[PDB]
Design a protein around this ligand. Structure first.
Ligand SMILES: NCCc1ccc(S(=O)(=O)F)cc1
Ligand SMILES: NCCc1ccc(S(=O)(=O)F)cc1
Ligand SMILES: NCCc1ccc(S(=O)(=O)F)cc1
Ligand SMILES: NCCc1ccc(S(=O)(=O)F)cc1
Ligand SMILES: NCCc1ccc(S(=O)(=O)F)cc1
Ligand SMILES: NCCc1ccc(S(=O)(=O)F)cc1
Ligand SMILES: NCCc1ccc(S(=O)(=O)F)cc1
Ligand SMILES: NCCc1ccc(S(=O)(=O)F)cc1
Lengths: 367, 367, 367, 367
């Protein structure tokens, strides 16, 4: 399937080989996608359109920590392990991205998974699992216990490097972004800092924004697209014909950055979001987490910092910052393009942004 | 049973009638205490010494929010719903305080409880439950699933006003503080802010500190007490004769404070902690959350702020601040006194601070 | 001359009557602009291209505080009075925006001005002046004491409502933005929340960004413009032909917001900046301060909060948030268009963004 | 003259050789003390009781940065350069501690001093001087321009290693703490972190707290001391018999800590303050700044991090934290003992805590 670039959307900078967070060596991603039932929602019975996405910063077999820092755009949402990140500049274990209703289940399941994987002497380090959410309430039975521990184990165990599936998968399965179908998106940038190159990888779970604000490559596009407004049981549910017939951003880099420097990286995410036109809804939980895969902390050991960067080194830091902004901008658009039309709970129907129209618009704007 | 004052420990200020967080009208507290098994710990088979403590800011039937603000002393621990508090200055639902291994279970159980209590239209407001932890790893099978959804429901439903049980109860059941038995403690102050008297109530779940640092009423008491060091299988496990035969602070007030003013309140907890001598362990998750029961936010309506206070009004603010410092100091000592000797997982034995010795020391120091 | 809209740049939303921060009633703005000398720079002798911009939140005769909250995009710069804003949610006195070299002089001058204007009994409230900077180092003798106490008095005393001068004036006089001439810009939005209208006004002092990242109305315009690169003594200083022949954002609103709510407003500034393409340089001090003119604190008195807004009231908050994003986006373009080509210290020459070319590009893009 | 230990006050831990911040190698301290005039205050004509204290983290000839992090206890005061510290984890140049009315003068004077001392290529790094304040309003003509640029230069140039003068000197000259004479205090700890011993040094400028709250070595001493309350014109101005005849903490360490780790150190200061009984007044600007003298950043070069420490290494981190708490606690008492009775502006008279009574009390409590 085409990604944003394939439909003629231009972006600045140089993407990595996979144009994904896994361009950062050693990062693994797994999805479990839960899609079952149709028709009217009954709490505890579905329909279910949900799941979980796992990111292993250093792979599923690592017991070590990664240096980390976060940023909050708008904090109406949950992301666990973040007080830890704020205090000691690192976290242990995987990142889980999921639906709001799944947070506690995922949190405990990650603990159960550790008991079966980790040496008992190291169990203390698995007590603060990192779990984050956006709300799949239009398409999913949020409270209905559709996600199981087995689902979580499968994502943890199945995670891998290489190409990352985008769209209606894992934590993104039941999401809605810019009044089009939401979900998972990813992008990367290879950046030049003097004689050195670094990779900045971004993955998003997008459930934010309004169609009328959306910009793609600077084009305010919602009004250029015809139709494709959401429907409920046959009736247009938004837009001019209404009535008629949160955002999680994960940044990986192999740059050997210190925790406070990774906070700076995280704070660049908002600028990439800003490029695409949204204004951070009052109830939209929008968060960024950044980590380094080269600045690593062996469990109970000496931190490994292979090289060290000056915060005032504009050449290096700006290269890295611009990388975050650009990869974030593109990951957001890649999400929209990868997500297909879906019908879910209560016959709610949300359209993937139409490929034919997007390509036509891009061709006209960028001949 | 005697509380700290009853053993001759002096404190400054005037406590409320109950000398507890429930001196703040409408606050309800519940505990479920889980104690089963003895001897060698096998993960999933106990022994269990754990539980959960519930605090309903406005009572169990409230759908409304309370103005709130938080502070971090040392952030190596979990407390959910805090991004929400940082962002919008309020939280919905109960505060749960529990052991580290129970966070996910408690988080989902609270959602489940809401489904059976609140109108479907208010379910959105129940998606970010507030759950905090300290670690009962010495006395409890942390990973062993000792806490059940029923335990959580019982605490949610059984919560009430009036006297608050202290010691080895609810979330505090298997905790250890200042190398003595840890647990739950509570105290309050009624403070004169001009011609208006507010109540400041504090509850702690204590699992922090070293005996060598402990100060009670300014007395460095660890070396004055003889014996009572922890044991394993009858062998002293800490202190000089070793070998021979986190902190959660919840502040309630009826002062009509704005969210940023409640952050100031929460930041006062550290001074109260400082009075008692600990230095915040590198891995001690020490947190404070402050809320108002008068500044309330009707769900989906207009915030109710019955009066308004100027931050530069020293008379009012300092009365409130001093209240927090004093009530926190006393709550910590009250905890120690209420907690009794316990033997738990792996035959670990932790002594309650000896009442006879404490009373003897206080009598000598304060005739 | 022309402002951005006059050159055919489209923006979203409805500007206030003045399309300026002074659309918020009672706000006063004053500039002192210092331009003297030409040729090679000698420290302490000029050339000078600097100044100061004063914003009185409630007018120059007010002794009262305004509710306030801030946000940091990248904190490599100075802005005094901000610890106060963080702590007590308000500040007293005017905001001064100036060149880095002028900070201390302006800070003390504001105290001096207070001694002469304020009742003796109220002098305590004047001890924490609000002063912020960006660096005019290419065009100005930064260290050379070009700004005087008299210059500051003149801006304090000459401040007024009505139209605000933009471009090479006040604190913006010697600034550079997006490799074109920087300086002062302003814009406003009147926003609708049901039957209620509010105004959000923004003023920027812009000294940030690179030409190659600049977006105006979503158009990446740096490569579309021919020439107009900076020069030093007749030699192109940047861009392809090189070698051959920080950001301060002030947000005012009449919305009756609490301090933590104004922090949310301030955090929206970054999204507006993001729209225009910059990525926050490592050494670019980018800050936002937001205040309410309706939520005011009589000195030594009871805060006046005429109405109260729920943070979860999306209709109201989103209206205000969108206002910040749009007004920030426009104030940045308004700055560029207002700023004229300038030659300063060491014969550095920076071009105002070319009006003829910009208009042509906008016409071609937006027929 | 005796310090606190010499009067019989016990403290925990091992001080460095000097028991002062200069036990951390390379740190230099300088004071300029300004004392002139008696009787009634007229703004601009004294009497003056003020000054400035300079701390050079790496000595007066250093152009390099030190890694640093800060904490706020209560933010109603000024400390410049802190946005920089928050963002990039270091600051350049000296720390100045002074009276509130002197901030702007000191800020500009430090720039002027740099112009004379620093190479031209390094001037950019001198643009964000670090200046902090407490308010000497009872004893000093705050607005009266008593401090001159020459005073600042003398303290910058006269700074040295070795014993540090305490009491009514430099920035502390006109201060008041716990209703006794305030001033400068300092202490250090050498702390055992495994097989390595680090030094933690602390200097305070104390202008905070109330006599009734003061604890010295856990003894609530205000009521044990007879007389010595402040007077105006021979009449008691505070306390029971009235009418009858802010805090700055600077932490230095040679531990090679990263910036986020120094924030942790700074957050420990509050516990040390807590030990001595104060509750952080609403208008008391109470701040801490911590820097490392081993983790240094050559100007425009590669950061030098000689060794690296794990945040979860309890043995090392707790040793450092305990050092901060104990050194802060002792610095505060050392201040009181060093500070002598002073009469200043408006015939305000503030007593040094009486040495004879203190020694007698300590002897009775600690036989
Ligand atoms: N991040 C998920 C969306 C969400 C879910 C709940 C809220 S609350 O303020 O009503 F608790 C806010 C935002
Ligand atoms: N045999 C003991 C296994 C075990 C069980 C629990 C832990 S904890 O510190 O993470 F709670 C550590 C080790
Ligand atoms: N608050 C519970 C104790 C705790 C549990 C785990 C950690 S971690 O750094 O190893 F993730 C830290 C502190
Ligand atoms: N209308 C059916 C009940 C219901 C209502 C709201 C939700 S929520 O996902 O937005 F919290 C879930 C289920
Ligand atoms: N905000 C003005 C620009 C500026 C000026 C100086 C610095 S410093 O890191 O060298 F202290 C950083 C940024
Ligand atoms: N009546 C004396 C005038 C005066 C002089 C100084 C102050 S201060 O607290 O701001 F330093 C206050 C009042
Ligand atoms: N840190 C100095 C004391 C101080 C504290 C507060 C202020 S004010 O801005 O709230 F009036 C002024 C001076
Ligand atoms: N290289 C010439 C001297 C000089 C260099 C830099 C500056 S500054 O404004 O960036 F601090 C000022 C003067």
């Amino acid at each position: 399937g085409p990604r944003a670039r394939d439909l003629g959307v231009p972006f600045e900078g140089t993407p990595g080989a996979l144009n994904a967070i896994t361009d950062v060596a050693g990062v693994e991603v797994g999805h479990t996608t839960v899609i079952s039932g149709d028709g009217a929602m009954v709490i505890g019975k579905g329909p279910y359109r949900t799941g979980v996405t796992i990111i292993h910063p250093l792979g599923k077999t690592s017991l070590d920590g990664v240096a980390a820092g976060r940023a909050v755009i708008n904090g109406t949402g949950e992301w666990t392990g973040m007080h830890l990140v704020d205090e000691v500049g690192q976290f242990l274990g995987p990142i889980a991205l999921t639906g709001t209703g799944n947070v506690g289940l995922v949190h405990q399941s990650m603990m159960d998974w550790s008991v079966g994987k980790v040496p008992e002497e190291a169990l203390f380090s698995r007590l603060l699992p990192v779990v984050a959410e956006t709300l799949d309430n239009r398409l999913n039975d949020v409270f209905g216990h559709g996600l199981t521990r087995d689902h979580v184990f499968a994502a943890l165990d199945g995670a891998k490097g290489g190409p990352v599936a985008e769209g209606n998968v894992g934590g993104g399965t039941g999401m809605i972004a810019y009044t089009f179908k939401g979900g998972i998106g990813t992008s990367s940038r290879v950046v030049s800092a003097g004689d050195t190159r670094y990779t900045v990888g971004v993955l998003v779970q997008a459930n934010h924004g309004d169609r009328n604000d959306l910009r793609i490559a600077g084009v305010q596009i919602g009004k250029e697209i015809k139709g494709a407004w959401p429907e409920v049981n046959g009736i247009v549910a938004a837009g001019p014909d209404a009535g008629k017939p949160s955002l999680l951003i994960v940044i990986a880099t192999d740059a050997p950055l210190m925790p406070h420097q990774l906070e700076r990286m995280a704070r660049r995410a908002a600028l990439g979001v800003g490029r695409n036109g949204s204004t951070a809804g009052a109830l939209s939980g929008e968060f960024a987490l950044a980590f380094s895969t080269s600045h690593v902390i062996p469990l109970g050991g000496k931190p490994r910092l292979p090289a060290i960067i000056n915060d005032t080194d504009s050449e290096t830091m700006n290269a890295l910052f611009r990388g975050v902004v650009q990869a974030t901008e593109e990951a957001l658009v890649n999400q929209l393009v990868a997500s297909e039309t879906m019908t879910g709970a209560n016959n709610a129907k949300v359209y993937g942004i139409p490929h034919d129209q997007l390509a036509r618009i891009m061709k006209a704007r960028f001949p």
